[PDB]
């Protein structure tokens, strides 16, 4: 019996709050201005993508989050692919407005969600995955301390519809205390 | 995903229906011993769960018949419609078919349907890291190990275990098909 509940996470001006329908126009618009950075995820420029993340939430298959800095929307991320009997999930489907590319915002987001996943939901496993072609995301997930677990062939389509492989990484609950220590050792006080 | 009938001589795979569940549960209870894991074949809700996913477009569970006789079940699940891709698994057969090769011909029929009818680019298979038997059967299919997912499943007694994930791409399918055919 695992049922995910809505969560807001904060640190300073950074707030992760449950995605609602009233956010979709602004997020779609911001994603479109970030079209070229989104070449490795197919969906964030279409309104349907956010409606389907809300549908999955309605069946308790996801907790999609809007990312705000102060008042302004800045992007999205989600917990998803719940394995309720473990419990396990996946974190990803993240994008940020290019004004935040390289400020440690992405790493702070993964930290907040990882901590919530392991410390509060007692996940035994958090999966992270990305396109085989998305080298930047592979390096950021490695620096998280996740371990690559495999490469799934012909497993996703990029923005043009080209077939790509998927790199799959995970953190287990027993290694999380070490991962957590190293992540918080990396944050500016 | 849509209902469908796959056949090969006496072997027939057809969509699972609620009316088959009593006989399948009963037949698995006669094979209780031979089912360490999985958890499922003795539980009617395990079958109804798969029927429910089918109404949501997420699984295609099949009754396995030899002639008119129900001998087991198997399914397609984990659909990725944009690729398209899926997983085949959740197979069990009563012990009269143990070591008879029916398992591999079932996989042959299912893999044919996924690649040659549905034109999938990826068929996934997986098993517990502790299930050495199922690993050897998957190897002999020619499926290539792709990943080891840690803490990815609970075994029948509840303990955490890793999952070995394998796949067959569409380009490997010709050779997989020929090697399956040669072994019949």
Author numbering:
A (entry chain A): 7 to 195
B (entry chain C): 10 to 193
Please quote the authors directly.
GCN5-related N-acetyltransferase (GNAT) toxin, with an acetyltransferase activity-dependent mechanism of translation inhibition, represents a relatively new and expanding family of type II TA toxins. We here describe a group of GNAT-Xre TA modules widely distributed among Pseudomonas species. Notably, other than arresting translation through acetylating aminoacyl-tRNAs, PacT can directly bind to Fur, a key ferric uptake regulator, to attenuate its DNA-binding affinity and thus permit the expression of downstream iron-acquisition-related genes. Previously studies on GNAT-RHH TA family also observed pronounced growth arrest after expression of the GNAT-type toxin and co-expression of its upstream antitoxin gene counteracted the toxic effect. It has been also demonstrated that the translational repression function of GNAT-type toxin depend on its acetyltransferase activity which transfers the acetyl group from acetyl coenzyme A (AcCoA) to the amine group of aa-tRNAs, subsequently resulting in the inhibition of translation.
In this study, we focused on a hypothetical P. aeruginosa TA pair pa3269/pa3270 that encodes a putative toxin PA3270 containing a GCN5-related N-acetyltransferase (GNAT) domain and a conserved acetyl-CoA-binding motif. This toxin has been hereafter referred to as PacT (Pseudomonas acetyltransferase toxin). The apo-form PacT exhibits a typical GNAT family fold consisting with a central, eight mixed β sheets which besieged by two or three α helices on each side. However, PacT exhibited low homology with GNAT-RHH toxins and the cognate antitoxin PacA bears a HTH (helix-turn-helix)-XRE (xenobiotic response element) motif; thus, PacTA was classified as a GNAT-Xre TA system. GNAT–RHH toxins, including E. coli AtaT and ItaT and S. Typhimurium TacT, have previously been reported to inhibit translation by acetylating charged tRNAs. These experimentally verified GNAT–RHH toxins only share 23.1%–25.53% identities with PacT, although all of them exhibit a conserved GNAT-fold and contain a unique motif (T/L-X-L/V/I-X5-G/K-X-G-L/F/W) for acetyl-coenzyme A binding. Taken together, these results confirmed that the PacT belongs to GNAT family and the PacTA constitutes a typical type II TA pair. According to the results, PacT directly bound to Fur. Next, we identified the interacting domain by using the truncated form Fur1-83 and found that this N-terminal DNA-binding domain could sufficiently mediate the Fur–PacT interaction. PacT can directly target the N-terminal HTH domain of Fur through protein–protein interactions without acetylation modification, but the binding of PacT obviously decreased the DNA-binding ability of Fur. Under iron starvation, the significantly increased PacT not only leads to overall translation inhibition and subsequent bacterial adaptation but also stimulates the iron uptake process by directly inhibiting the DNA-binding affinity of the negative iron acquisition regulator Fur.
